[PDB]
Paper text:
In this study, we performed systematic biochemical and structural studies of the bindings of three SAM domains, two from previously identified Eph-binding proteins (SHIP2 and Odin) and one from a new Eph-binding protein discovered in this study (SAMD5), to the SAM domains from every Eph receptor. Our study reveals that the Eph SAM domains have exquisitely specific target SAM domain-binding properties, although their overall SAM-SAM heterodimer formation modes are very similar.
To elucidate the molecular mechanism governing the specificity of the bindings of SHIP2 SAM and Odin SAM1 to Eph receptors, we determined the crystal structure of the SHIP2 SAM-EphA2 SAM complex and the Odin SAM1-EphA6 SAM complex at the 1.5 Å and 1.3 Å resolutions, respectively. The crystals diffracting at very high resolutions of both complexes were facilitated by fusing the Eph SAM domain to the C-terminal tail of the SHIP2 SAM or Odin SAM1 with a flexible linker (14 residues ‘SSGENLYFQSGSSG’ for the SHIP2 SAM-EphA2 SAM complex; 17 residues ‘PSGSSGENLYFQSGSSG’ for the Odin SAM1-EphA6 SAM complex). The covalent linkage did not appear to affect the overall structure of the complexes, as the linkers in both complexes are sufficiently long and flexible. As such, replacing Gly at the beginning of α5 of Eph SAM with any other amino acid residues will introduce steric hindrance in preventing their binding to SHIP2/Odin SAM. The very high-resolution crystal structures of the two complexes also allowed us to identify a unique interaction feature that is critical for the exquisite specific interaction between the EphA2/A6 SAM domain and SHIP2/Odin SAM domains. Finally, EphA6 SAM could bind to both SAMD5 and SHIP2/Odin SAM domains, since it satisfies the binding criteria of both types.
Residue numbers in the entry: 27 to 195
The structure:
Amino acid sequence: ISGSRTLEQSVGEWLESIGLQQYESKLLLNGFDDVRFLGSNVMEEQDLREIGISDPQHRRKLLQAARSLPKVKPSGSSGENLYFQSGSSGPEYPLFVTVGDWLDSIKMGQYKSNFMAAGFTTFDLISRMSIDDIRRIGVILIGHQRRIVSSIQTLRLHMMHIQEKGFHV
């Protein structure tokens, strides 16, 4: 586009908007560090307890607020992209052509070497990974683990759908 793009808030600015900024360091230090990757499949009550949000009313408030954030479709890569789209004008869902490009789409590129060192370089390998499997290759921060597993789930849904349609199996 020729015109400007509006930028997303920081986690701190978002928390201030909902009266919960005292939890900023706990979120950031545990990988809840980008407002594009917070909310229902990603942020869970038990995780909030574990990182030290002991106040149950604040946990409920935070979880509801995270659910109110827009779901931002992942950006394609600057190199090659593979997209699924429903309808002539529907949203493009990227499927990626490399593990690195997939990780970059969720700002998790720092973990490419972790996946490579484990030999987890194909979709088929990665698609069945649990949170525990992800932690075990060295993704320690809970907010990053949750982000990755949520992304895997949505990518797997799209890939299964395509397979079920019966042409690219």
